[PDB]
Amino acid sequence: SIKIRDFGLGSDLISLTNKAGVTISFTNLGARIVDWQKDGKHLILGFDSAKEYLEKDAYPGATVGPTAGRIKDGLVKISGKDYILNQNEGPQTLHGGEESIHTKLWTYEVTDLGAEVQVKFSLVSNDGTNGYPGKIEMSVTHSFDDDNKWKIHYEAISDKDTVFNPTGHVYFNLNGDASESVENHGLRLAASRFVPLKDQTEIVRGDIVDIKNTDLDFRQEKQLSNAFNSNMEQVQLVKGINHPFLLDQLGLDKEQARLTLDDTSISVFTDQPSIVIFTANFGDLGTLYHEKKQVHHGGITFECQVSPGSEQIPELGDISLKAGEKYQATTIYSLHTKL
Amino acid sequence: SIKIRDFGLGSDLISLTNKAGVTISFTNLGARIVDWQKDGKHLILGFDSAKEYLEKDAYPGATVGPTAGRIKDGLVKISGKDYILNQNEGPQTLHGGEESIHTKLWTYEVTDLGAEVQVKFSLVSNDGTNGYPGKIEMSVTHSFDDDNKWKIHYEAISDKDTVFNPTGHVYFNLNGDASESVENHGLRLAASRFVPLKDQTEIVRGDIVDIKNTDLDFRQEKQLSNAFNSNMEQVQLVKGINHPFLLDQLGLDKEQARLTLDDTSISVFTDQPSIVIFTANFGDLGTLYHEKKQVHHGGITFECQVSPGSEQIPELGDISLKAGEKYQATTIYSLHTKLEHHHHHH
Numbered sequence A: 001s002i003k004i005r006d007f008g009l010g011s012d013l014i015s016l017t018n019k020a021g022v023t024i025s026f027t028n029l030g031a032r033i034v035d036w037q038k039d040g041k042h043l044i045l046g047f048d049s050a051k052e053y054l055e056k057d058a059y060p061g062a063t064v065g066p067t068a069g070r071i072k073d074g075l076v077k078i079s080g081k082d083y084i085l086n087q088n089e090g091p092q093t094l095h096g097g098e099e100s101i102h103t104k105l106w107t108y109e110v111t112d113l114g115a116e117v118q119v120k121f122s123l124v125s126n127d128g129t130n131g132y133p134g135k136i137e138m139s140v141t142h143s144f145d146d147d148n149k150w151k152i153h154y155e156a157i158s159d160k161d162t163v164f165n166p167t168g169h170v171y172f173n174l175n176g177d178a179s180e181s182v183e184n185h186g187l188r189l190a191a192s193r194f195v196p197l198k199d200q201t202e203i204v205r206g207d208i209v210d211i212k213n214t215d216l217d218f219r220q221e222k223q224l225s226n227a228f229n230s231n232m233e234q235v236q237l238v239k240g241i242n243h244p245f246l247l248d249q250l251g252l253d254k255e256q257a258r259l260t261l262d263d264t265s266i267s268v269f270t271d272q273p274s275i276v277i278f279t280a281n282f283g284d285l286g287t288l289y290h291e292k293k294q295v296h297h298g299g300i301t302f303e304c305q306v307s308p309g310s311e312q313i314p315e316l317g318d319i320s321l322k323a324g325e326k327y328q329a330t331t332i333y334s335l336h337t338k339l
Numbered sequence B: 001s002i003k004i005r006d007f008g009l010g011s012d013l014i015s016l017t018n019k020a021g022v023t024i025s026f027t028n029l030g031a032r033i034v035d036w037q038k039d040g041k042h043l044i045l046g047f048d049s050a051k052e053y054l055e056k057d058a059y060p061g062a063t064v065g066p067t068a069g070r071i072k073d074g075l076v077k078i079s080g081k082d083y084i085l086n087q088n089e090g091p092q093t094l095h096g097g098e099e100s101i102h103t104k105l106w107t108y109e110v111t112d113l114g115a116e117v118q119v120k121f122s123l124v125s126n127d128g129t130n131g132y133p134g135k136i137e138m139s140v141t142h143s144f145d146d147d148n149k150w151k152i153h154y155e156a157i158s159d160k161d162t163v164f165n166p167t168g169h170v171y172f173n174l175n176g177d178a179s180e181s182v183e184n185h186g187l188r189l190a191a192s193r194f195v196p197l198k199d200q201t202e203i204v205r206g207d208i209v210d211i212k213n214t215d216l217d218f219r220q221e222k223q224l225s226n227a228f229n230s231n232m233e234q235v236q237l238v239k240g241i242n243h244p245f246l247l248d249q250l251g252l253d254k255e256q257a258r259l260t261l262d263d264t265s266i267s268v269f270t271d272q273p274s275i276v277i278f279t280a281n282f283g284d285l286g287t288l289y290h291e292k293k294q295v296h297h298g299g300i301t302f303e304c305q306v307s308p309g310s311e312q313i314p315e316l317g318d319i320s321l322k323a324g325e326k327y328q329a330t331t332i333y334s335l336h337t338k339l340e341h342h343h344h345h346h
């Protein structure tokens, strides 16, 4: 079934309940995922109204871009030309700059296919918006089906050469409670390398490091506490994890990662080359979710996209988008319950 | 009372009924007025869903900006610097460029004051959007009261020195039918001069002309047909009216314009210096409004703002906005009955 309701400030809340009784909800504010629940338990983090997002934290579950992550000095070069983007974190351009697409009301249309329901959100990024050449017509399709597969499909077209590399910012918490650390969760991840950060500014350091046999090797399922109790300078630098992991094998068919807690597991699939993992290293902040004080490590993201830092490490890839070219991306979060 | 419902594509329809039974409605898509009715008659032009606006004509009743009208070659000078804005009408920048504010979903909050209800829509124009320095935090408050006054209040603040001169794009048609020309309406307008357009591109000519005693003089109420039937060059150039009228006496207190049809009048008050009037000179385009094919001259706007062309005619004004300086503009449309005797035949 589908239900639509006012989410606050003119935003809407779209909730889909599949054949299994599983419920997922989104909002046009930032084309984002608001909740995901089973047997009355939430699997991800989210607020209860639009205002909260706006007052507390605008990132959770949002579509971020046009470029996800940090860009050193807000500088990108397009067609051999230097362009300076909005700087919203020191000299860096983080998640597209201030007041980005995650804070806009996107238009949308719901398409019911029976076993699957789709919600297509659309937004036009005007040429010059936050320094980015455009215009960029974008759409993000969130769909949910009877197999408990939540999928995100992106598309974009620009009138001019530009840069484009958005991501989905859902935070998972299989504990179903923000006051509870995800350290008890088990993680498996098909990445043998990672991108170290320079320093507390969180810009990339400049190199690619092999994680094989370190506290960050999750090629074999392991509990998070491990990584969390590590003395790796990199873990110590951010106070948990806040890094791009390079997937070993590319392709939407491969389970790139798996988050498990008890009989509940989330599998991640993407056509992207990297997964940025952030463990809600907020320390004492205590943001409130469902009236629950958030704890350091009370959440974890799987941001699938091209690794940030390509400006300095070209090997990472290239986020350019040429005029007329159609950008496409897909990421899937599949839910499974053991028997 | 207040009612809200989905209007399509994610936009909402906010409907107000005052104590007099008059209803009016708005949508967050372009912080725009959708309808205004009296005794079941539409006083304005509007569509029935959000998709219509996007598919047929996105301007009607919208809030347009950041700069209303045409900027020759999309060129503005901001604090000694030249800036080139999005050019969406040939080399011209018309109504802030492509996919401007009128096309966006604004957030909004409703404030019930009893005899008055306010709908405050908000949006942020990011720095550099369509070439405009920002960011610009904007808000438009549409309000309706028990006295039948519909008021629009604009507010804005920029992080950088920029330009700002927005307007409301409502179209009136007292016939309550798009297929009926407004040439049968009576018009009174407190303006002695107007700004002629150079040619079909519609940029300003460069001069200010005195229209007293011409077919464009409405200081004393006259039927619109007088204008429509005129062969004055300017009328012929645009096939009707599509010009800025320089108000003679400024001030929010003065009735600058009055549009009448029989027993109904719409009075216009504003704190702006000019009123740009466009009479839906669409020829046989025939856009469908409520299943009625719109006729040439099947509507009229009163866009209150600083006149367009100040780039070329400095005398018109200064639409610049200094960083940190707060912009405000107020326009009011008031509805009356039997204000005067208007008994004609066309």
Ligand SMILES: OC[C@H]1O[C@@H](O)[C@H](O)[C@@H](O)[C@@H]1O
Pocket: B057, B059, B202, B242, B278
């Ligand atoms: O689409 C509506 C537009 O039509 C043009 O002919 C007018 O000059 C514009 O001012 C008006 O907003």
Ligand code: NA
Pocket: A006, A007, A010, A011, A012, B010, B011, B012
């Ligand atoms: Na809504």
